[PDB]
Each structure stands twice: as C-alpha cells, then as structure tokens.
Structure 1
Amino acid sequence: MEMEKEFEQIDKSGSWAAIYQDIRHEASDFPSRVAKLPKNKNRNRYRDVSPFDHSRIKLHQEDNDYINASLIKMEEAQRSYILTQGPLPNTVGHFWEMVWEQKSRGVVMLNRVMEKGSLKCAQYWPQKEEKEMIFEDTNLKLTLISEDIKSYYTVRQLELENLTTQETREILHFHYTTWPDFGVPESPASFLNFLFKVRESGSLSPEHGPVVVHCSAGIGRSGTFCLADTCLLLMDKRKDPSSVDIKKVLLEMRKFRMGLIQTADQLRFSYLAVIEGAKFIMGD
C-alpha cells in the first residue's frame, strides 16, 4: 500500500502495536559473540543491545578492537551510517578513535547528557574553547572551535588532532536537544529541519566517511533518523515514489543492527516524518 493512506488505515484501526510486533518477529537474528566476551562488559551500556559480528566497527588496535557500533550500508539509497551507543566513561577515547579511523565528518547526537534524572551518556566533548580534552588511551586531542545554539538544536565546530601524527580535522557536532523525556515529538517539523541541516553540511555525503549517529542505546531515536533519511532519498531516486515501503526499509536496516525503532510510537513517528518530509522536498 501507499504510505499516507496505510497510515490513516492503521490510525483508524488502532493497530500500531500489532504492526510493530510483526516487524519484531520478522527481524534478523545474527551472532554478537565479540560483544558478549567477558573482557568487553564495561564497553556495553545495556546488556540486551549489542552489535552483530558481521557489521560491527573494528578499532584499529591489536589489544582490543571492540566498540558497541554498527555499519548500516544501504545499497539502493547509496548511503551509509554508523550507529553507536552514547559513550561511557571508559569508552570516550574509543569513540573519537572510531571517528578518526572511519574518516567521519559529522556526529549526530539525539539525547541530552541527563534525562529522567539519570546519566544517558558521558560528557564527551569540551564545553569551553580554552578547556580542551586529551584522551590519553588513544592519543587524541579535541578542541571546541565554535558553538551555535538554536531553539531546537545546537551545532558545534570541533578540532580533532591525532597527537601521533599531528594531523588535524574539522568535525561537526549536530545536537538535537529537544526530544521529550517520554514519548515522541508531537510534530516532526523540528526533527525534519534538523535532518536537513545535517544534509546541508556535507556530513552524509560520499566524499566523507559515514556519519556517526547516537542516542543512549543507539537503536531508537538513532533508528528514526536514518530510517527517515533513507526513505526520503529513495522517494527522490525512484520513478514511482509511492513504491517506497517503510516497513521493508526498516527490516533491511535491522540486518545490520538489532532493535532499530524501540516502540510503536517511534514507528508511527517515523511514518509521520517521511510523509511530511516528502511534501516539502517538492517540489513544494
């Protein structure tokens, strides 16, 4: 079926939970043996969220190459994404090592450091220009260059230096700051505006390594971001945009990381975002 009318048909019939459970039943199951090794327990935020072995990002290190991060490679859309958990106190150096080694331009953050009164990820970037951060375990230096605070999101320019080679690179930090502590946003308008700002920066384009996107577990809000982006790109590429099947795209993405889209409300929100986004692209 088309999307917008399949949407109204699920709303009127109140069957979002049944649709979402079907997705959960059909999703891929692949091994995640490296994630479960005892030496990696303090590298995982949640015991039930792990990268598959076949798609995990490897650190360029001979001691321990493990990070909780997955490469989502979308062949028809010609887009790739790295989805990862919010960094932990003992993985902030691994996080920036990955950004460096994978040649990423941008980092997309969809959570606040504290939500619901608890810590959802480490404070992994510097908050003042004159107070830079040094990660001694991976030999990197990170400096805040500039910050632009807007009503729904903040964009930061950061300098990452590989202290071993003295090479430097500019990284863009795109921080969506207004996702509610409970539920999903009422309108997708600010989330779509944010997606378009990431696109306009070059961070999603083939001349760079894959964008790094995270929330707390790296599957819920993060899944919503890449699912909406890929569906909108396919609607632009194809002769028949009504042929884009959001459930099929989500199942394809779940071949590369478990659990993408965590609730039926996140599934409904993803439909809403693609539907509204397709009107703004045109041609209107």
Structure 2
Amino acid sequence: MEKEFEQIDKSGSWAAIYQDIRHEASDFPCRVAKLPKNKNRNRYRDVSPFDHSRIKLHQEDNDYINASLIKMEEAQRSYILTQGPLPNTCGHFWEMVWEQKSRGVVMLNRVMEKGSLKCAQYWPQKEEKEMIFEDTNLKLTLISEDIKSYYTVRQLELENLTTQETREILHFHYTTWPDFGVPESPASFLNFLFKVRESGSLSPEHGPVVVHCSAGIGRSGTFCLADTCLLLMDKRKDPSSVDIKKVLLEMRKFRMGLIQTADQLRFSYLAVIEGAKFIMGDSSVQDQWKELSHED
C-alpha cells in the first residue's frame, strides 16, 4: 500500500487509478428512489441508493429514505450512509436512527457551504429549543455539546413519544471538511475517527452508525473506507494484505459514488497508512494525532 502509494505519486497516476475504480464500480437498479412520489425525498437526482441495500423506514405510507446499508461482511461492521436530510425528511432521518437502533451520527459537512444549502438543520442548536418531528412522533433535545477547533461532539436525547422510551445519540460533527475536498491532515482525520471509535458508537452491540455529508458519498465514503480498512487490517491480523482499491469496490456494491475525487482517494491511502501505525502496536501515535490536530 505504501510502496503502491509512492509508485502512484511518482508517476502522477491518481486520476487514472481513480477513474479505473469508477469504471469498475457496481451498477445496480435504484427503481424505488426514482419513483415520482419519491422525487422530493432526494436531494440530488444523480445520487440514489441501490434497491438491494436501501434502508426501509418502518412506515406503511412510504418506506423510502435516500440511505444505504453498507454491510462490510469480512470486517464485521456496517454503516448507514445517507444524504444530508431535507426540510421534509428530517423526521424520516430520525425514524431511521430509531428503527435501526443507531447510537451515533457522524456528520462531515456544514449546513451551508460556499453560500449554498447542503443539509437541513436537523438537530437542536440550543438546549431550550428541542425539536418535535410530528410526522414521526419523535422528540429530540440537545443535552450538551463539546466544541473543538475543527469538530464538535453533541449529546442528544431522542424520544419515541408513543412509547416514551428515550435514547442518547452521540453526534460527531466534523466542521472543517470542505465539499469535494479532504481533511487538513491525516492526523486530524484519525483523531476524529478514533474519537468516534472510543465513544462506543461503532460497537456491534448497537445498530449501524449513520454517516452523512451532503450527498452521503464523497466525504462519507472517505470516512468509511479508512475505518473499514483499518478494521480489516486488525481483523485479519495482517495489515499488509489490505488492498484499499478492492475495499472501495466492495463498499461501492452498497452505494454508488463513494469517494468523489482522486484526491480523496489519495487522502484515504494517507490516512490508512498512518493509521496502520496504531494497528501495528504504536501506543503513542494516538496522542500525537491529537496534538497535531490542535483541537483546543
């Protein structure tokens, strides 16, 4: 991976490598997503979930939500990748979180980027102004927030108003990841990923973590590809055996377009190679990522 990385850098073939993945990527139908009645549930006409892996809402009216279950069998971890919710799909979004029993939500975009709306304000910004999604019978309250320089971690309480059951949902918000861009450095990305891991949100005891950006494929795909590769390195107890391009193709069987630019692919290599140090036993690299990230 490292020598393949340098080989690609030397010859400047990141674009060629990335285009090959695009050409080889799976193509499955997205009939449900394309139904006329679901047009207002899709943020982008060219980003849809495959029918075979789409998440179904547990409601009779219309069970559609632009979200995909990325089930990585060998690594033993599943993620739900979804688009940033629209003003009319925020209730659907939390219904999915509730039904799929997710413990964490990872957001990699901002509500507004470069002057345009990319995601609805689907969570409460203030403790005293909780949100009620009447269409879904759910209530969401901000309990507390831990604000860092480039990301914020929020504690939310989600309540099923019908049963009165409540659950704590952790919200991991990366606020400086530019659209179609990459994190400031491998260290800041890994420090964030390990914060999510240490929280317990990715544990198989919970439902799949929900990951999203604006379309739920570029930044979200980068986040999941790095996490799955690192997980696979330890799962196999053989880090050098992990082929990142093959892992990306496997993930693309579940949702189209994961990793949206050749540079995000390049960053993925960088993050995984650096992350492999922790897998290889370096018990000091984690604290180094934290320092290099300047989260204070």
TM-score (norm 1): 0.97
Q: Separation in 2 of the partners of 1:61 and 1:79? A: 26
Q: Tell me the CA shift for residue 180 of structure 1.
A: 2.9
Q: Tell me the CA shift for residue 72 of structure 1.
A: 0.4
Q: Residues 123 and 239 from structure 1, CA distance in 2 versus in 1: closer, same or farther, beyond 3 angstroms? A: closer
Q: Residues 182 and 85 from structure 1, CA distance in 2 versus in 1: closer, same or farther, beyond 3 angstroms? A: closer
| Secondary structure of 1:273's aligned partner | helix
| Secondary structure of 2:78's aligned partner | strand
Q: Residues 181 and 254 from structure 1, CA distance in 2 versus in 1: closer, same or farther, beyond 3 angstroms? A: closer
Q: Residues 26 and 198 from structure 1, CA distance in 2 versus in 1: closer, same or farther, beyond 3 angstroms? A: same
Q: Tell me the CA shift for residue 182 of structure 1.
A: 5.9
| Secondary structure of 2:162's aligned partner | coil
1:250 is matched with which residue?
248
2:169 is matched with which residue?
171
Q: Separation in 2 of the partners of 1:249 and 1:282? A: 20
Q: Residues 182 and 19 from structure 1, CA distance in 2 versus in 1: closer, same or farther, beyond 3 angstroms? A: closer
**Alpha-carbon deviations, 1:78-135, whole Å to 9, x = none?**
0000000000001000000000000000000000111011111001101111111000
Aligned partners of 2:196 and 2:202 also within 8 Å: yes
**Alpha-carbon deviations, 1:157-206, whole Å to 9, x = none?**
00001011111111000001111356323421111000000000111011
| Secondary structure of 1:265's aligned partner | helix
Q: Tell me the CA shift for residue 152 of structure 1.
A: 1.6
2:52 is matched with which residue?
54
Q: Separation in 1 of the partners of 2:110 and 2:237? A: 40
Aligned partners of 2:180 and 2:218 also within 8 Å: no
| Secondary structure of 1:51's aligned partner | coil
Aligned partners of 2:156 and 2:169 also within 8 Å: yes
| Secondary structure of 1:48's aligned partner | coil
| Structure 1 range deviating more: 48-57 or 185-194 | 185-194
Q: Separation in 2 of the partners of 1:243 and 1:281? A: 13
Q: Separation in 2 of the partners of 1:241 and 1:184? A: 24
1:69 is matched with which residue?
67
Overall identity of the aligned pairs, in %? 99
Q: Which runs of 5+ in 2 are unaligned?
A: 282-295
Q: Tell me the CA shift for residue 240 of structure 1.
A: 2.7
Q: Separation in 1 of the partners of 2:102 and 2:14? A: 36
Q: Separation in 2 of the partners of 1:72 and 1:232? A: 16
Q: Tell me the CA shift for residue 281 of structure 1.
A: 3.3
Q: Separation in 2 of the partners of 1:266 and 1:156? A: 26
Q: Separation in 1 of the partners of 2:196 and 2:237? A: 26
Q: Separation in 2 of the partners of 1:142 and 1:185? A: 29
Q: Which runs of 5+ in 1 are unaligned?
A: none
**Alpha-carbon deviations, 1:210-265, whole Å to 9, x = none?**
00000000000000111000100111122432110000000000000000001101
Q: Residues 10 and 186 from structure 1, CA distance in 2 versus in 1: closer, same or farther, beyond 3 angstroms? A: farther
Runs of 4+ aligned structure 1 residues displaced above 3 Å come to none
TM-score (norm 2): 0.93
Q: Residues 117 and 12 from structure 1, CA distance in 2 versus in 1: closer, same or farther, beyond 3 angstroms? A: same
Aligned partners of 2:180 and 2:260 also within 8 Å: no
| Secondary structure of 1:81's aligned partner | strand
- RMSD between aligned alpha carbons? 1.7
| Secondary structure of 2:69's aligned partner | strand
Q: Tell me the CA shift for residue 25 of structure 1.
A: 0.7
Q: Separation in 2 of the partners of 1:183 and 1:106? A: 24
| Structure 1 range deviating more: 177-186 or 189-198 | 177-186
